[PDB]
């Protein structure tokens, strides 16, 4: 249990990739604050964390709202007695050519994916810096490494996360806090399904990656003092940049 | 005059890098619509375009406002009779550690730098696609290739522009429209001290100029088979 | 013991980064074939692998020589009963401006760092592909991501490893074999290293154990391939 | 004529991409030393340079041989009276999976593409440095940005050129010499491969020697661009 005695916050932690990361960190010894917008899913995943022998707390958090993000950090400290790892895994996606993108489409993806990550990171800094050790783990995407047609807004938001991660890493490099990004390739969940199915043919391994894969990378960052500023692809070979 | 008969819109075109790009493209034969928020500067740069023998139009445009950006495209078509090149060169910057960044700081830089570029590109698509040829040129930054401490928000916005550029390039690759980014290194104007220190980090040890950026803009505007690229003009600071 | 029952070859495994990787993989359950040119160091590191409760084999290998590299793979199959992981960690460096580089300087670094990695990978390929499972792990450098002045030949060789890695990963992507690179930053010529630490945001060197941790990650990640991951305190992220 | 009075060496300059670059630089005012192994092609291309009103010199050069590369640089100084631009555009390719690659395959591609570029650059340094101005332009490939399956050796060699370019740019950054790379996409067994690679080009068409010459002219006239490796590839990669 490398993470015994530690506390992790996972935004978007109730399902999909966030759940995978939470359950992996919990398996490795961390108590978890799950932050999401899905009430039943939060409860279910909390039960799974507890089934691993860990403590779990839940927060209803819209990551675009600074007050909710601050309260989330305050709750980890109050309910679980600390904070060591912040995983920003809240994310939204839609598929439209730029010609068909509305301002709402643009703002939604940029605000949740990029601004939400900024707000989460900012909220955790004072505590992590004061304790002289911490792990910030942002979940971007391979769409943060390559521009995807009909996902230009989503790519912009994920590129933003990659760049934000690297810059913040450099700010905190002498503070004992590492900052890294996980870049998932295709993690399964119709236009979206048809798109997903086609993208798999472009993956050299020809198969999707899993939430558990992402959790393994999160656990690696969480236990590597000398890795910071990186954006690592878990994508079956699609890109290596 | 490689761009003879063509029309370019340059947002942020009244001063700095935008002006440099505008005057380079005008020197190369293009008539220019200058879009910015500075009235006297717009007038002055318009006079410089006309002094080169070109026609110039001016628009007062807040690139965060879609209606103004649409009107801008409409004005190039109405006043100058067409549109061939769109240069998105509106940009803002501030220096703060993330711990000191406000939401206003984040939103200002992201909305001007990234959303403004999205809105500009979107407004020009219908026309450029219809005529089967076009050049979209986004001005990012080397901060779109490397995260800069105390500029994390600025880096996010410029990374966004690089990614957006590449994605849009792929959407338009069979439409005859190329989409590329210019990534300036250090182009002069806390800010001064920061600028001065960054120069020591440039292998050539000197700043780059608006004219350098204009030369890259002219290259993109005259290269059919280059698209999706983000080329650094930065004295060797980064090559990614 | 995630690597229980598996066999790893580690070239350059007698000392430094190679040794760190060998000991991490051995700690995680792998039996190790150590390949190097240092006899006493080979014996000492073999004893350390055995002290971890693992079996160890030793091969005297010049990685620029295909016959030796091929025999190394054959020895793993014969002495340890199989092969699951190949770590190419033989590497050499010298510091000269291009103006002062000799052909010998160029060929030495390119043959050891790049051609040696090609030969190792090629030698292990048939077996890993036939069994439908395998891990190939190349040790490049951050100098494979950024050109270093007075190290242009060294950068050329490590860029070559990064590109070779990605290409081979794509060839084997449907064969159950992953191919990845470890890119160490500065692992404690001495004056140069001290000067390079100014370029590391964390302001400290990385360790052979750090690299061993990344090797263990690659060795246990089915769905990561073609990657070149930097362990470098923030120096580069490309 | 932005390059009026200047002298350029173009290795591999007798045909293909090298020829395109030579003619663009000559068109822009430079006198040219063409270095290659093709006798008839060298003569033909030299006549084309002279038809542009420029002077042309010819050298029979194997870029893997240091003495020949040194003689090439000396010939530019002696025959054309100077040297301002070096274009390293000698290049070879073959297609084999790693499982089928021979040492001969590996060495051929690495020695010509990478070592030949090292040798070309090294031979020109003393002169370019002494005059405080110069342009070194290496021709890599998009295979120097992405690993290509069945071209692992070729990718290795072109990745090497990209890294070498960036490193050398940093050595010379205060010497008035810029060092950059041109990365061509697909420029028209090899033919079948090319046809398949076009599926990977967003624009769906190949690029031309003239495209590469245009980028060469750009580098040759941009003081403040150095260390870069710019892709001319219809959108295949932007890294
Ligand atoms: Cl699948
Ligand atoms: Mg501290
Ligand atoms: Mg059309």
Short mmCIF file of N, CA and C in Angstrom, two decimals, chain D residues 93-224:
data_model
loop_
_atom_site.label_atom_id
_atom_site.label_comp_id
_atom_site.label_asym_id
_atom_site.label_seq_id
_atom_site.Cartn_x
_atom_site.Cartn_y
_atom_site.Cartn_z
N UNK D 93 16.55 5.54 -48.93
CA UNK D 93 15.46 4.90 -48.20
C UNK D 93 15.35 3.45 -48.65
N UNK D 94 14.89 2.58 -47.76
CA UNK D 94 14.51 1.23 -48.14
C UNK D 94 13.40 0.80 -47.19
N UNK D 95 12.61 -0.18 -47.60
CA UNK D 95 11.47 -0.58 -46.79
C UNK D 95 11.61 -2.03 -46.35
N UNK D 96 11.77 -2.23 -45.04
CA UNK D 96 11.85 -3.55 -44.45
C UNK D 96 11.35 -3.51 -43.01
N UNK D 97 10.55 -4.50 -42.61
CA UNK D 97 10.26 -4.65 -41.18
C UNK D 97 11.56 -4.89 -40.43
N UNK D 98 11.62 -4.51 -39.16
CA UNK D 98 12.82 -4.70 -38.34
C UNK D 98 13.23 -6.17 -38.36
N UNK D 99 12.25 -7.06 -38.36
CA UNK D 99 12.54 -8.49 -38.38
C UNK D 99 13.35 -8.89 -39.62
N UNK D 100 13.26 -8.09 -40.67
CA UNK D 100 13.96 -8.41 -41.91
C UNK D 100 15.10 -7.46 -42.26
N UNK D 101 15.32 -6.45 -41.43
CA UNK D 101 16.40 -5.49 -41.65
C UNK D 101 17.78 -6.11 -41.45
N UNK D 102 18.68 -5.88 -42.40
CA UNK D 102 20.07 -6.30 -42.25
C UNK D 102 20.90 -5.17 -41.67
N UNK D 103 22.09 -5.50 -41.20
CA UNK D 103 23.03 -4.47 -40.78
C UNK D 103 23.41 -3.57 -41.94
N UNK D 104 23.53 -4.15 -43.14
CA UNK D 104 23.81 -3.35 -44.32
C UNK D 104 22.71 -2.31 -44.53
N UNK D 105 21.45 -2.72 -44.37
CA UNK D 105 20.30 -1.81 -44.51
C UNK D 105 20.38 -0.65 -43.52
N UNK D 106 20.64 -1.00 -42.26
CA UNK D 106 20.73 -0.02 -41.19
C UNK D 106 21.86 0.97 -41.46
N UNK D 107 23.05 0.44 -41.74
CA UNK D 107 24.23 1.27 -41.88
C UNK D 107 24.14 2.17 -43.09
N UNK D 108 23.57 1.67 -44.18
CA UNK D 108 23.45 2.45 -45.41
C UNK D 108 22.63 3.71 -45.15
N UNK D 109 21.47 3.52 -44.54
CA UNK D 109 20.58 4.63 -44.27
C UNK D 109 21.14 5.56 -43.21
N UNK D 110 21.72 5.00 -42.16
CA UNK D 110 22.26 5.85 -41.10
C UNK D 110 23.49 6.65 -41.57
N UNK D 111 24.38 6.00 -42.32
CA UNK D 111 25.59 6.67 -42.80
C UNK D 111 25.32 7.76 -43.83
N UNK D 112 24.46 7.48 -44.80
CA UNK D 112 24.12 8.49 -45.80
C UNK D 112 23.28 9.62 -45.21
N UNK D 113 22.18 9.28 -44.54
CA UNK D 113 21.22 10.30 -44.11
C UNK D 113 21.69 11.13 -42.92
N UNK D 114 22.29 10.47 -41.94
CA UNK D 114 22.68 11.14 -40.71
C UNK D 114 24.16 11.50 -40.69
N UNK D 115 25.04 10.52 -40.86
CA UNK D 115 26.47 10.81 -40.83
C UNK D 115 26.87 11.75 -41.98
N UNK D 116 26.28 11.55 -43.15
CA UNK D 116 26.58 12.43 -44.27
C UNK D 116 26.20 13.86 -43.94
N UNK D 117 25.13 14.03 -43.18
CA UNK D 117 24.71 15.38 -42.77
C UNK D 117 25.66 15.97 -41.73
N UNK D 118 26.06 15.13 -40.77
CA UNK D 118 27.09 15.53 -39.82
C UNK D 118 28.36 15.98 -40.55
N UNK D 119 28.82 15.18 -41.51
CA UNK D 119 30.06 15.49 -42.22
C UNK D 119 29.96 16.77 -43.05
N UNK D 120 28.81 16.96 -43.69
CA UNK D 120 28.57 18.16 -44.48
C UNK D 120 28.60 19.40 -43.61
N UNK D 121 27.87 19.35 -42.50
CA UNK D 121 27.82 20.46 -41.56
C UNK D 121 29.21 20.77 -41.00
N UNK D 122 29.92 19.73 -40.57
CA UNK D 122 31.23 19.91 -39.96
C UNK D 122 32.21 20.57 -40.93
N UNK D 123 32.14 20.19 -42.21
CA UNK D 123 33.08 20.72 -43.20
C UNK D 123 32.85 22.21 -43.46
N UNK D 124 31.62 22.68 -43.27
CA UNK D 124 31.30 24.06 -43.61
C UNK D 124 31.43 25.02 -42.42
N UNK D 125 31.57 24.47 -41.21
CA UNK D 125 31.52 25.29 -39.99
C UNK D 125 32.58 26.37 -39.94
N UNK D 126 33.83 25.99 -40.17
CA UNK D 126 34.95 26.91 -39.99
C UNK D 126 34.75 28.16 -40.83
N UNK D 127 34.36 27.97 -42.08
CA UNK D 127 34.16 29.09 -43.00
C UNK D 127 32.94 29.94 -42.64
N UNK D 128 31.82 29.29 -42.34
CA UNK D 128 30.61 30.03 -42.04
C UNK D 128 30.81 30.81 -40.74
N UNK D 129 31.43 30.17 -39.74
CA UNK D 129 31.71 30.83 -38.47
C UNK D 129 32.63 32.03 -38.63
N UNK D 130 33.66 31.88 -39.45
CA UNK D 130 34.65 32.93 -39.62
C UNK D 130 34.04 34.19 -40.23
N UNK D 131 33.08 34.02 -41.14
CA UNK D 131 32.48 35.19 -41.78
C UNK D 131 31.27 35.73 -41.01
N UNK D 132 30.87 35.02 -39.95
CA UNK D 132 29.83 35.51 -39.06
C UNK D 132 28.43 35.48 -39.63
N UNK D 133 28.24 34.74 -40.71
CA UNK D 133 26.93 34.62 -41.34
C UNK D 133 26.85 33.34 -42.15
N UNK D 134 25.73 32.66 -42.08
CA UNK D 134 25.61 31.44 -42.83
C UNK D 134 24.27 30.79 -42.61
N UNK D 135 23.93 29.87 -43.50
CA UNK D 135 22.70 29.11 -43.39
C UNK D 135 23.02 27.64 -43.61
N UNK D 136 22.71 26.81 -42.62
CA UNK D 136 22.80 25.37 -42.82
C UNK D 136 21.38 24.81 -42.86
N UNK D 137 21.05 24.07 -43.91
CA UNK D 137 19.70 23.57 -44.12
C UNK D 137 19.75 22.07 -44.38
N UNK D 138 19.26 21.29 -43.43
CA UNK D 138 19.27 19.84 -43.53
C UNK D 138 17.92 19.33 -43.99
N UNK D 139 17.90 18.33 -44.86
CA UNK D 139 16.62 17.81 -45.30
C UNK D 139 16.36 16.52 -44.55
N UNK D 140 15.42 16.57 -43.60
CA UNK D 140 15.06 15.36 -42.87
C UNK D 140 13.85 14.71 -43.56
N UNK D 141 12.73 14.61 -42.85
CA UNK D 141 11.53 13.91 -43.32
C UNK D 141 10.48 13.93 -42.23
N UNK D 142 9.21 13.77 -42.58
CA UNK D 142 8.20 13.52 -41.55
C UNK D 142 8.49 12.23 -40.79
N UNK D 143 9.28 11.34 -41.39
CA UNK D 143 9.71 10.12 -40.70
C UNK D 143 10.74 10.46 -39.62
N UNK D 144 11.15 11.72 -39.57
CA UNK D 144 11.95 12.19 -38.46
C UNK D 144 11.12 12.76 -37.32
N UNK D 145 9.80 12.75 -37.49
CA UNK D 145 8.86 13.25 -36.48
C UNK D 145 7.96 12.13 -35.96
N UNK D 146 7.71 11.15 -36.81
CA UNK D 146 6.87 10.01 -36.46
C UNK D 146 7.61 8.75 -36.86
N UNK D 147 7.58 7.73 -36.02
CA UNK D 147 8.17 6.46 -36.44
C UNK D 147 7.27 5.83 -37.49
N UNK D 148 7.85 5.43 -38.62
CA UNK D 148 7.10 4.71 -39.68
C UNK D 148 7.38 3.22 -39.64
N UNK D 149 6.31 2.40 -39.54
CA UNK D 149 6.49 0.95 -39.58
C UNK D 149 7.10 0.51 -40.92
N UNK D 150 8.00 -0.47 -40.86
CA UNK D 150 8.79 -0.95 -42.01
C UNK D 150 9.81 0.07 -42.51
N UNK D 151 9.94 1.16 -41.77
CA UNK D 151 10.96 2.16 -42.04
C UNK D 151 11.64 2.57 -40.75
N UNK D 152 11.78 1.65 -39.81
CA UNK D 152 12.31 2.00 -38.49
C UNK D 152 13.73 2.55 -38.59
N UNK D 153 14.52 1.97 -39.48
CA UNK D 153 15.89 2.43 -39.70
C UNK D 153 15.91 3.80 -40.36
N UNK D 154 15.02 3.99 -41.33
CA UNK D 154 14.92 5.27 -42.01
C UNK D 154 14.46 6.35 -41.02
N UNK D 155 13.44 6.04 -40.22
CA UNK D 155 13.01 6.96 -39.16
C UNK D 155 14.16 7.25 -38.20
N UNK D 156 14.89 6.21 -37.80
CA UNK D 156 15.99 6.43 -36.87
C UNK D 156 16.95 7.47 -37.46
N UNK D 157 17.26 7.32 -38.74
CA UNK D 157 18.22 8.20 -39.39
C UNK D 157 17.70 9.64 -39.50
N UNK D 158 16.40 9.78 -39.71
CA UNK D 158 15.82 11.11 -39.91
C UNK D 158 15.52 11.79 -38.56
N UNK D 159 15.14 11.01 -37.56
CA UNK D 159 15.07 11.52 -36.18
C UNK D 159 16.45 12.06 -35.79
N UNK D 160 17.49 11.30 -36.13
CA UNK D 160 18.86 11.74 -35.87
C UNK D 160 19.16 13.09 -36.51
N UNK D 161 18.71 13.28 -37.75
CA UNK D 161 19.00 14.56 -38.42
C UNK D 161 18.30 15.72 -37.70
N UNK D 162 17.06 15.50 -37.28
CA UNK D 162 16.29 16.53 -36.55
C UNK D 162 16.99 16.93 -35.25
N UNK D 163 17.44 15.95 -34.47
CA UNK D 163 18.11 16.21 -33.21
C UNK D 163 19.46 16.88 -33.44
N UNK D 164 20.19 16.42 -34.44
CA UNK D 164 21.50 16.99 -34.77
C UNK D 164 21.36 18.47 -35.15
N UNK D 165 20.34 18.74 -35.97
CA UNK D 165 20.02 20.09 -36.45
C UNK D 165 19.79 21.02 -35.25
N UNK D 166 18.95 20.59 -34.31
CA UNK D 166 18.60 21.43 -33.16
C UNK D 166 19.85 21.67 -32.29
N UNK D 167 20.63 20.63 -32.09
CA UNK D 167 21.81 20.74 -31.26
C UNK D 167 22.83 21.69 -31.89
N UNK D 168 23.09 21.51 -33.18
CA UNK D 168 24.07 22.34 -33.87
C UNK D 168 23.60 23.79 -33.94
N UNK D 169 22.29 24.00 -34.12
CA UNK D 169 21.74 25.36 -34.10
C UNK D 169 22.14 26.08 -32.81
N UNK D 170 22.07 25.36 -31.69
CA UNK D 170 22.41 25.94 -30.39
C UNK D 170 23.91 26.24 -30.26
N UNK D 171 24.76 25.42 -30.86
CA UNK D 171 26.19 25.67 -30.84
C UNK D 171 26.56 26.95 -31.59
N UNK D 172 25.82 27.22 -32.66
CA UNK D 172 26.12 28.32 -33.58
C UNK D 172 25.23 29.55 -33.42
N UNK D 173 24.38 29.56 -32.40
CA UNK D 173 23.33 30.58 -32.30
C UNK D 173 23.87 32.00 -32.15
N UNK D 174 25.07 32.14 -31.60
CA UNK D 174 25.67 33.46 -31.42
C UNK D 174 26.75 33.71 -32.46
N UNK D 175 26.81 32.85 -33.47
CA UNK D 175 27.84 32.96 -34.50
C UNK D 175 27.31 33.50 -35.83
N UNK D 176 26.03 33.83 -35.86
CA UNK D 176 25.42 34.40 -37.05
C UNK D 176 25.03 33.34 -38.06
N UNK D 177 25.15 32.07 -37.66
CA UNK D 177 24.77 30.97 -38.52
C UNK D 177 23.50 30.31 -38.01
N UNK D 178 22.50 30.19 -38.88
CA UNK D 178 21.30 29.45 -38.50
C UNK D 178 21.34 28.03 -39.05
N UNK D 179 20.69 27.13 -38.32
CA UNK D 179 20.67 25.71 -38.68
C UNK D 179 19.22 25.23 -38.56
N UNK D 180 18.65 24.79 -39.68
CA UNK D 180 17.26 24.35 -39.70
C UNK D 180 17.04 23.11 -40.54
N UNK D 181 15.88 22.48 -40.36
CA UNK D 181 15.57 21.29 -41.13
C UNK D 181 14.30 21.45 -41.92
N UNK D 182 14.34 20.93 -43.13
CA UNK D 182 13.16 20.77 -43.96
C UNK D 182 12.68 19.33 -43.80
N UNK D 183 11.41 19.15 -43.48
CA UNK D 183 10.84 17.81 -43.33
C UNK D 183 9.78 17.54 -44.38
N UNK D 184 10.17 16.99 -45.54
CA UNK D 184 9.19 16.67 -46.58
C UNK D 184 8.26 15.53 -46.20
N UNK D 185 7.04 15.57 -46.72
CA UNK D 185 6.08 14.51 -46.49
C UNK D 185 6.30 13.40 -47.49
N UNK D 186 5.44 13.35 -48.49
CA UNK D 186 5.56 12.40 -49.59
C UNK D 186 5.80 13.15 -50.88
N UNK D 187 6.97 12.95 -51.49
CA UNK D 187 7.29 13.62 -52.74
C UNK D 187 7.51 12.65 -53.91
N UNK D 188 6.61 12.68 -54.89
CA UNK D 188 6.69 11.75 -56.01
C UNK D 188 7.86 12.08 -56.96
N UNK D 189 8.11 -1.08 -55.30
CA UNK D 189 7.86 -1.20 -53.86
C UNK D 189 7.67 0.16 -53.23
N UNK D 190 8.60 1.07 -53.51
CA UNK D 190 8.56 2.43 -52.99
C UNK D 190 7.31 3.17 -53.46
N UNK D 191 6.93 2.94 -54.72
CA UNK D 191 5.76 3.60 -55.30
C UNK D 191 4.47 3.14 -54.64
N UNK D 192 4.34 1.83 -54.42
CA UNK D 192 3.18 1.28 -53.73
C UNK D 192 3.08 1.83 -52.31
N UNK D 193 4.22 1.92 -51.65
CA UNK D 193 4.27 2.49 -50.31
C UNK D 193 3.82 3.95 -50.32
N UNK D 194 4.33 4.72 -51.27
CA UNK D 194 3.95 6.12 -51.40
C UNK D 194 2.44 6.27 -51.58
N UNK D 195 1.86 5.45 -52.45
CA UNK D 195 0.42 5.50 -52.70
C UNK D 195 -0.36 5.27 -51.41
N UNK D 196 0.09 4.32 -50.60
CA UNK D 196 -0.56 4.05 -49.32
C UNK D 196 -0.38 5.20 -48.33
N UNK D 197 0.78 5.84 -48.36
CA UNK D 197 1.05 6.92 -47.41
C UNK D 197 0.17 8.13 -47.71
N UNK D 198 -0.25 8.30 -48.96
CA UNK D 198 -1.09 9.44 -49.31
C UNK D 198 -2.42 9.39 -48.56
N UNK D 199 -2.86 8.18 -48.20
CA UNK D 199 -4.06 8.05 -47.40
C UNK D 199 -3.89 8.76 -46.05
N UNK D 200 -2.64 8.93 -45.62
CA UNK D 200 -2.34 9.58 -44.34
C UNK D 200 -2.15 11.09 -44.44
N UNK D 201 -2.15 11.61 -45.66
CA UNK D 201 -2.01 13.04 -45.90
C UNK D 201 -3.39 13.68 -46.01
N UNK D 202 -3.73 14.56 -45.06
CA UNK D 202 -5.06 15.18 -45.05
C UNK D 202 -5.42 15.83 -46.40
N UNK D 203 -4.47 16.50 -47.04
CA UNK D 203 -4.76 17.12 -48.33
C UNK D 203 -4.90 16.10 -49.46
N UNK D 204 -4.41 14.88 -49.25
CA UNK D 204 -4.62 13.82 -50.21
C UNK D 204 -3.81 13.97 -51.49
N UNK D 205 -2.71 14.70 -51.41
CA UNK D 205 -1.83 14.87 -52.55
C UNK D 205 -0.40 14.95 -52.08
N UNK D 206 0.53 14.63 -52.96
CA UNK D 206 1.94 14.69 -52.60
C UNK D 206 2.41 16.13 -52.60
N UNK D 207 3.60 16.35 -52.03
CA UNK D 207 4.26 17.64 -52.08
C UNK D 207 5.35 17.56 -53.16
N UNK D 208 5.96 18.70 -53.50
CA UNK D 208 6.87 18.76 -54.64
C UNK D 208 8.27 19.24 -54.27
N UNK D 209 9.27 18.97 -55.13
CA UNK D 209 10.59 19.56 -54.87
C UNK D 209 10.52 21.09 -54.76
N UNK D 210 9.65 21.74 -55.52
CA UNK D 210 9.52 23.19 -55.47
C UNK D 210 9.06 23.66 -54.09
N UNK D 211 8.14 22.91 -53.48
CA UNK D 211 7.69 23.22 -52.11
C UNK D 211 8.89 23.27 -51.16
N UNK D 212 9.77 22.28 -51.30
CA UNK D 212 10.93 22.19 -50.43
C UNK D 212 11.89 23.34 -50.73
N UNK D 213 12.03 23.71 -51.99
CA UNK D 213 12.86 24.84 -52.36
C UNK D 213 12.33 26.13 -51.73
N UNK D 214 11.01 26.29 -51.70
CA UNK D 214 10.43 27.46 -51.06
C UNK D 214 10.78 27.53 -49.58
N UNK D 215 10.76 26.40 -48.88
CA UNK D 215 11.09 26.43 -47.46
C UNK D 215 12.57 26.74 -47.32
N UNK D 216 13.39 26.15 -48.19
CA UNK D 216 14.82 26.43 -48.15
C UNK D 216 15.07 27.93 -48.31
N UNK D 217 14.34 28.57 -49.22
CA UNK D 217 14.54 30.00 -49.46
C UNK D 217 14.12 30.80 -48.22
N UNK D 218 13.06 30.33 -47.57
CA UNK D 218 12.62 30.94 -46.32
C UNK D 218 13.72 30.92 -45.25
N UNK D 219 14.25 29.73 -44.95
CA UNK D 219 15.33 29.60 -43.98
C UNK D 219 16.52 30.49 -44.39
N UNK D 220 16.84 30.47 -45.68
CA UNK D 220 18.00 31.21 -46.18
C UNK D 220 17.85 32.72 -46.02
N UNK D 221 16.62 33.19 -45.80
CA UNK D 221 16.36 34.63 -45.67
C UNK D 221 15.70 35.01 -44.34
N UNK D 222 15.85 34.16 -43.33
CA UNK D 222 15.27 34.45 -42.01
C UNK D 222 16.34 34.37 -40.91
N UNK D 223 16.88 35.54 -40.54
CA UNK D 223 17.95 35.64 -39.52
C UNK D 223 17.54 35.04 -38.19
N UNK D 224 16.27 35.17 -37.84
CA UNK D 224 15.85 34.89 -36.47
C UNK D 224 15.14 33.56 -36.32
#
